[PDB]
Design a protein around this ligand. Structure first.
Ligand SMILES: Nc1nc2c(ncn2[C@@H]2O[C@H](COP(=O)(O)O)[C@@H](O)[C@H]2O)c(=O)[nH]1
Ligand SMILES: Nc1nc2c(ncn2[C@@H]2O[C@H](COP(=O)(O)O)[C@@H](O)[C@H]2O)c(=O)[nH]1
Ligand SMILES: Nc1nc2c(ncn2[C@@H]2O[C@H](COP(=O)(O)O)[C@@H](O)[C@H]2O)c(=O)[nH]1
Ligand SMILES: Nc1nc2c(ncn2[C@@H]2O[C@H](COP(=O)(O)O)[C@@H](O)[C@H]2O)c(=O)[nH]1
Ligand SMILES: Nc1nc2c(ncn2[C@@H]2O[C@H](COP(=O)(O)O)[C@@H](O)[C@H]2O)c(=O)[nH]1
Ligand SMILES: Nc1nc2c(ncn2[C@@H]2O[C@H](COP(=O)(O)O)[C@@H](O)[C@H]2O)c(=O)[nH]1
Ligand SMILES: [K+]
Ligand SMILES: [K+]
Ligand SMILES: [K+]
Lengths: 480, 480, 480
């Protein structure tokens, strides 16, 4: 039976351990996890939230960027819906707030409360600038939640506002962080509007944003100090329109995402996106792939990053429906060998269950990991909490399954051989502490490889293969 | 321990994945699944229903041919019974209906209803031609279910019939599909009898059959426009008599089927079948085999197709009773290497659980797959629905087990070391949608291999081996 | 502890058995199950499908009426939606079809096919009458599915139609069933339009409807030969508008349905419905109640029928959330004692698990039973089939639970302490055979009471109480 002997063996994460190496690491603090998402996008931590409609919408994208990673907004929504989520992410924080929310002086406190609970930002906004009219936005004063706390619904805005002559106001549209910090410290105020030469409202700077920018600059930020966020598109004719509008909404990267990324459909979508100035202003990531030849083709088509993984996802059953796939450790090894020589970062997407798997993925050459299941069921993941026979749970479902595709039909106003499933995950709490523990686990693995950086982790890691017997010894055994 | 190291390793479907390849496939519609069952028999889809007495009798054979595959009628029945199932399959549809059912004009509506519910076709027939007597069949008119809907049981046929002078009748025994379509369109009628020069009834053409022939020519048809169907025989002296009578009944292929096909018993049965003009008019398929040497021997004996599989069947325990077998992927690889050079198609028989396994079998060189378990418990599978501790189930049982062999004794009017078992499967509904989903899964696997045809799938597919750890990552993991 | 001793004991179905009595019943056919739903509505069988959004929409209501029972359309939909379901039920069959579907002669076969698949009747319609224009409906001919079977999408209706001068047409707007049967038998036709003095189309009579009316008159029919159907309303101001529109749509009874029917809200809704001529034309049923005092109050308010049951429903948890309820056998006994003296039929609603429970409910005085769980998951029940960890299932959910109430918000375009739950039931197949088996079980229980009628069952039944030990002996014990 000679044909069988020539078939190569592919490995997944559970097939290997990282071999301990000489470590000069003395402090857990010396281990730097900064990495590249794509050719022109750096991240403080190598964690990407999956573009799944049970993992990443605006609340997850905001949380991931705040931890120093990023979320990819899923495309199983209308273009209008996807862009709206993106604008909400961009609205979470800023340095100079463009188009700050305003109100007119003859309006009521009831209308002030409605403006403060603006649906354009999760949590609303903390102040409204009082202006004479919508067209001129001549600044008359400012009103905050605090100023409304004892008001009757009928009380006028101007009766409760701080007038502009009592405000600290600037005309410096280039004001620095140090300068506005000085104005707030000296003026003992929490809001500095920026106005034009005719007193018209141009920007707002808030103490909340200044405090964040002065603190740990872990957060993933664009050039305006807003949170970084990506968005997924498909490969159909209409996806080009989606891509253009996502970039207009502020997308920092686009992710071309189809099950079989080694296809002309994906290669031609990448070429189209790099060929149009309306979309070529942002890095184009493409997947999903699992071979050296596929990496070469997508890189040659112009991809700024590659997403690796055919079948390993928790809710994925491509391997059961089509029979196709590559064990994920071998896929990462093969794809990153090609990509590293061309300078193209790779996302290891799918099949990760523990922080230990993240260490292995980075050790096998990945620059980032993409997580679905490990982040599903967190507070910030979309969906309702449900009681699944006793405990609190949330839905996780494949994007090639029935549930996600009927929901894509219900949201976009519209013969499926499914390649994903639906299930529940236990509610995990806020995603922040979970991400921090995963990064802490990665740092432990880097210390075992003697690595103080991601590039050192990729260069220094050596693996040893284990049998099923070795795998059992690796988890907890013999206790209850 | 050197002897052990020289034993080769055989692989089954769960040992490998199809490696994704460059795909130029743009539309799911561009993927053609047409294939060969045997040297002279083509099929639109590569699915064969197993010759098991819990899988394929007349209703399953009809359904499979209608989907573009085929069923193999099992031989655990009397010759008379096997031939009767075959004639019912052939009676399901036709272009020219030979010996159409008739009735005499002085008969009653009660007798008309009995003739319409003729046991020679599942569902009966829709019309009876009224003729003067059984010997001359001079056409007097036609009576349909519609004409009986308000009749009393005592009303005469001729009182309710449409008379012949009001019918559209032809004398063209070579009438084309376009010509009879024109006669039906112009005559605004649903039945065109074909009569001889003396008005005697020769054939009938019905609108139902014309509509089918005008629609999607997916269905597996013989030269008369009837559904294709095969039949199994053994290797005993009496099996030659069974074979002759099956061919007379309309069998389109014969399948010589014994557990150990690499035996003189099987080789000599193939030689006997090719040597007799009463059976050599149809392709002779033989199995079951699992080695290159076995393929060579059966091909040299004259086989037009090979059936591959020793032990992998869901209900099979040959490997537990005799200890013999070959892991099915390696068996397909080895057998098809020999057979492809001789032009002999191969059926991968047994051990298939998902559409993904079908993609692997075709990728390993098989031209068709044979399914037992995946089709058992469908509406069209034989047997009664049963309640197995709550839910609706149907029996599936091995043909070398006790249950099937006592039933073979009860049907043919008649020291077993069993090599099959009995069990239940959940009721699956109609087989049609299940077959369509399996073919859809296969098309997905072909797209991953970049293949637009079965021959391209066989040439282009490359496998990667996975460990048990890789297999776990391949299904659903970490969700409920 | 004397206070405790004075609390009476309530019984449920599992607490009692029907004591066998002297039976003169010789044939299973002698047992008549005809009963009253309400003062002025009779049913051939005593089975009512529950007004739950997982049990009864138009397909279930049609099936129940065809078996001789009735369905109550649920109100967790817009008024427009509830009325639309009702009109579809009324459209399922008729004697004189009002406003039969028409088409114009210059239209295409493609437009004919669209008219035949009219969404106003489940399954569409079988013919379209060809008329000169929508305003006059002068009959020009008729076109059927059969006439389109060989047409091109572009072929004109008038080219394919049967012209009116070749049709059998009547001007008798009072035509009897015997007379139209004669016209169809003599004319050898399946459609008899009824036209006016100027040839304008007034009604259509079809052979399908005639055959049904000639067969077993088991079906629950209104005076026009359409299927009987009821509809639920609440007790809010807007429910009066819903009630008026339901009656206009053809509702044969209205069911005032709230959890606590012994309340001024329910009593005043009944009084309002009986007091308005727009709703007083149909029987008003009210519930849910569980005491003699409650029956007296609703009867005094004018109820034509009572629905009995507080808490016993399969998906109901009123008893766990509020702590209130009455064991269902005792509730039926107490309520029917009052109602029988006033001539008001009672529906035993909830907690029924087997046909044996139905016999007990009727024996305890109920005129009908209402079933949710036993009919959920049938083909005709609403909702999608789902795979719940292996087998095919359908959702069943309480109308006071979260799932049904969010769906009521999604359908009507809109602080819940839930009193119902959600769950799955195994798919049961078509509801018809299930209903027939339940009625067969009831007939067996009636035979044990020596009863040949429902009234005899209510008068003759005697119960014996069993302990938990007796209950175990009653089901299957000691076998696998
Ligand atoms: N006041 C105000 N804050 C905004 C607006 N848009 C976004 N934000 C964000 O909302 C946060 C304000 O926090 P606060 O202290 O106002 O609750 C900051 O991160 C700020 O950038 C806006 O229009 N007005
Ligand atoms: N084959 C397949 N992969 C999916 C499907 N849905 C999500 N995925 C993949 O699974 C990844 C998540 O993997 P997880 O971290 O949950 O194991 C996603 O980022 C995506 O690449 C699906 O329906 N089919
Ligand atoms: N009328 C008629 N149909 C037959 C006979 N034998 C087989 N059939 C098949 O029964 C089907 C007729 O459908 P119908 O429209 O008659 O229900 C066709 O597929 C036809 O070929 C026969 O003897 N008479
Ligand atoms: N060894 C053995 N094979 C069987 C027996 N019965 C059926 N088979 C094989 O099992 C195949 C069905 O495999 P399945 O698709 O159910 O896994 C049949 O086509 C036949 O080759 C049996 O009793 N013993
Ligand atoms: N032809 C026709 N049938 C209707 C219409 N509305 C309801 N139906 C019902 O549809 C059924 C007709 O069955 P057919 O034989 O037309 O398939 C009958 O029960 C009939 O009452 C209509 O407008 N036209
Ligand atoms: N208390 C309560 N009863 C319900 C609820 N939903 C349905 N029901 C009752 O339960 C009955 C169905 O009972 P089943 O036949 O499923 O045991 C319905 O007809 C209705 O009276 C609910 O959410 N709460
Ligand atoms: K361990
Ligand atoms: K998987
Ligand atoms: K018993």
């Amino acid at each position: 039976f000679n044909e069988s002997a020539s078939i190569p063996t592919g490995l997944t994460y559970d097939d290997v351990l990282i071999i301990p190496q000489h470590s000069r690491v003395t402090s857990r603090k010396e281990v730097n996890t900064t990495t590249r998402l794509s050719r022109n996008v750096k991240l403080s931590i190598p964690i990407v939230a999956s573009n799944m409609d049970t993992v990443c919408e605006q609340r997850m994208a905001v949380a991931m960027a705040r931890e120093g990673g990023i979320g990819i907004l899923h495309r199983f929504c209308s273009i209008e819906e996807q862009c709206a989520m993106l604008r909400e992410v961009k609205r979470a924080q800023s340095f100079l707030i463009e188009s700050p929310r305003i109100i007119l002086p003859h309006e009521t406190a009831r209308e002030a409360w409605e403006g403060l609970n603006w649906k354009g930002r999760v949590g609303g906004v903390g102040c409204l600038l009082v202006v004479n009219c919508k067209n001129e936005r001549k600044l008359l004063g400012i009103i905050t939640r605090h100023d409304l706390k004892l008001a009757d619904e009928s009380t006028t805005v101007e009766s409760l506002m701080t007038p502009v002559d009592k405000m600290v106001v600037s005309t410096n549209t280039s004001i620095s962080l140090e300068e506005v910090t000085h104005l707030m410290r000296k003026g003992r105020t929490a809001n500095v509007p920026i106005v034009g030469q005719n007193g018209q409202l141009l920007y707002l700077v808030t103490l909340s944003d200044v405090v964040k920018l002065r603190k740990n600059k872990q957060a993933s930020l664009d050039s305006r100090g807003r949170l970084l966020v990506g968005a997924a598109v498909g490969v159909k004719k209409d996806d080009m329109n989606r891509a253009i509008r996502l970039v207009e909404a502020g997308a920092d990267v686009l992710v071309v995402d189809i099950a079989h990324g080694h296809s002309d459909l994906c290669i031609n979508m990448v070429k189209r996106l790099k060929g149009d100035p309306r979309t070529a202003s942002v890095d184009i990531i493409a997947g999903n792939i699992a071979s050296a030849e596929a990496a070469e083709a997508l890189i040659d088509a112009g991809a700024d990053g590659l997403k690796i993984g055919v079948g390993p996802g928790s809710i994925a059953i491509t391997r059961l429906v089509a029979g196709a796939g590559v064990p994920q450790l071998s896929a990462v090894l093969a794809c990153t060998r090609v990509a590293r020589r061309r300078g193209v970062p790779c996302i290891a997407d799918g099949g990760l269950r523990t922080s230990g798997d993240i260490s292995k993925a980075i050790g096998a050459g990945a620059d980032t990991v993409m997580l679905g299941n490990m982040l599903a069921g967190t507070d910030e993941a979309p969906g309702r909490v449900l009681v699944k026979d006793g405990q609190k749970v949330k839905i996780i479902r494949g994007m090639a399954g029935f549930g996600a595709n009927l929901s894509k039909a219900e949201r976009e106003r519209t013969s499926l051989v499914p390649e994903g499933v639906e299930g529940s995950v236990a509610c995990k709490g806020p995603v922040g502490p979970i991400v921090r523990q995963l990064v802490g686990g990665l740092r432990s693995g880097m210390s075992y490889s003697g690595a103080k950086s991601i590039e050192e982790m990729q260069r220094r890691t050596r693996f040893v293969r284990m049998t099923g017997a070795g795998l059992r010894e690796s988890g907890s055994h013999g206790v209850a």
